Design a protein around this ligand. Sequence first.
Ligand code: ROA
Ligand code: ROA
Lengths: 111, 115, 115, 111
Amino acid sequence: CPLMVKVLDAVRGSPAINVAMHVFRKAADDTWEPFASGKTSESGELHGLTTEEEFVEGIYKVEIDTKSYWKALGISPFHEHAEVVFTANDRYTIAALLSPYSYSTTAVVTN
Amino acid sequence: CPLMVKVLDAVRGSPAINVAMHVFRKAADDTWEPFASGKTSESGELHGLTTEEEFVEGIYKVEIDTKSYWKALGISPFHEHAEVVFTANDSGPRRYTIAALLSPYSYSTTAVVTN
Amino acid sequence: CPLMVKVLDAVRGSPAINVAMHVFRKAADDTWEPFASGKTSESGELHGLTTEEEFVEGIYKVEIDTKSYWKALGISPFHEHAEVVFTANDSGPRRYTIAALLSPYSYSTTAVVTN
Amino acid sequence: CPLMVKVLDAVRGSPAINVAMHVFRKAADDTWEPFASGKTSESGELHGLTTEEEFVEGIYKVEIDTKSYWKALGISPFHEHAEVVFTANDRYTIAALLSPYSYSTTAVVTN
Ligand SMILES: O=C(/C=C/c1ccc(O)c(O)c1)O[C@H](Cc1ccc(O)c(O)c1)C(=O)O
Ligand SMILES: O=C(/C=C/c1ccc(O)c(O)c1)O[C@H](Cc1ccc(O)c(O)c1)C(=O)O
């Protein structure tokens, strides 16, 4: 698991479950190539997105569909999605904490 | 205005209006003494808590009553209050802006300190 | 000023000054078209990006160049930029204030929307 | 583990390790009684603070010594400590994300 994403709900005080996200890698034409995707588990976590071999240096974007999440809860949200864009350089945990009109994201990088 | 507090609502995307807060200052006997209090305006801001002469060096605590704010909106929040504790003016007078961003089960707070 | 962006530095407790950002608007062909750009002032604020007439309904993206900000302070940060994507004016004209609070490995963003 | 505390460092992108904290329970004279304490592990987590039997309804305060943490890193901090005050009502994870002039805290409450 070189890359894990965890999503939390600041309104309900819970993991944010069934949140869909896509991971993209920046290509040489500066376009975003689909790389991996999935939805968060009951613990708010999404594991197994990639492998050590595949996860090479480059610029990656995690696009978290926060809008669909708030919509399912019947709460009007501000953002279309939450975006985390970063360079991988030679384990990454991306955490996102969601509110309807605000989000925060942090990275925990370990070894 | 060497001390201003601003409170924002992350659920509604608005200032948090009519939020009560109390400020305390640590006394020589290490007890918290009442220093100032007030509530946020329509802009989410609370101005005029103190003056440059009164706001001497010390350890200050701002207790923001976030629980009453959420309850009045029908929400049972996690925290009793948001608490901000800091040493002020240790290197001479500064202006302090304390900001708090509120959600029912979370809050963030930051300080902007100017000279 | 129906769109203002404010950026704060959580490491230094200050506005984040001279932070560049670009705003884009989604076109009919679903591509991001350049809309406005600028950099934050000494107050951490960027005003005057657009006008009420120009800021029509649509999906907007604000890309805040947080990486260059940290690099100039000697810090190699995690993120390439902070991105804020939202639908604007869907229920008529609103005023939007986007705030971002920056740390080297984290950022928070909120919106204040008024009518 | 009815109560766990996790602390993260937003400057270094890491768990905040060896962060001391004390947990207090509000007494009937509105004073704070020491209840439990400890310091965060290498994963930034503090477990085993209390038990199901002891952790009764009441108002609790977690006082996290963030100032000593930043001092050890040679970084001047704003806050004396980070405080989380909440009512327990009939598992609690308190997370804190730290920067020198800012902190955020959230609660993940599950069953
Ligand atoms: O605690 C957080 C996030 C807390 C948080 C608190 C305030 C914020 O603004 C914010 O963006 C995040 O994430 C950690 C991340 C994490 C999860 C599972 C893991 O295995 C791990 O190694 C790290 C957790 O949930 O244990
Ligand atoms: O209130 C905010 C937003 C702070 C904030 C606080 C926590 C967050 O997580 C976050 O994303 C943003 O910042 C400033 C605070 C402020 C600083 C200087 C001033 O003169 C002022 O009037 C307000 C603003 O509203 O202009």
